[PDB]
Design a protein around this nucleic acid. Structure first.
Length: 49
RNA sequence: ACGAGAACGCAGCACCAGCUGUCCAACCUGAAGAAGA
């Protein structure tokens, strides 16, 4: 209902625990642009699932 | 009828006394019990 999801909070956010997301466990969105990282995630995850 | 006869090279004696197989040294280094859609 709310889903506030604040951002730009001086880097005061960390995601710890289960259910955080597949993005939080992999470092490829922050080393490549949108299309390259998207395709890399799709290729590496279609191998998994 | 032998320069010969008889005669233990034998007796007692601890290879023994003192002395640390000791000194120094992290079982240590890195790792999300976690993710489809």
């Amino acid at each position: 209902f709310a889903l506030d999801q604040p951002s730009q909070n001086q880097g005061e956010i960390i995601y710890i625990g289960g259910g955080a997301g597949f993005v939080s466990k992999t470092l490829h969105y922050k080393s490549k642009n949108r299309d390259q990282a998207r395709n890399d995630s799709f290729d590496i995850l279609k191998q998994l699932f």
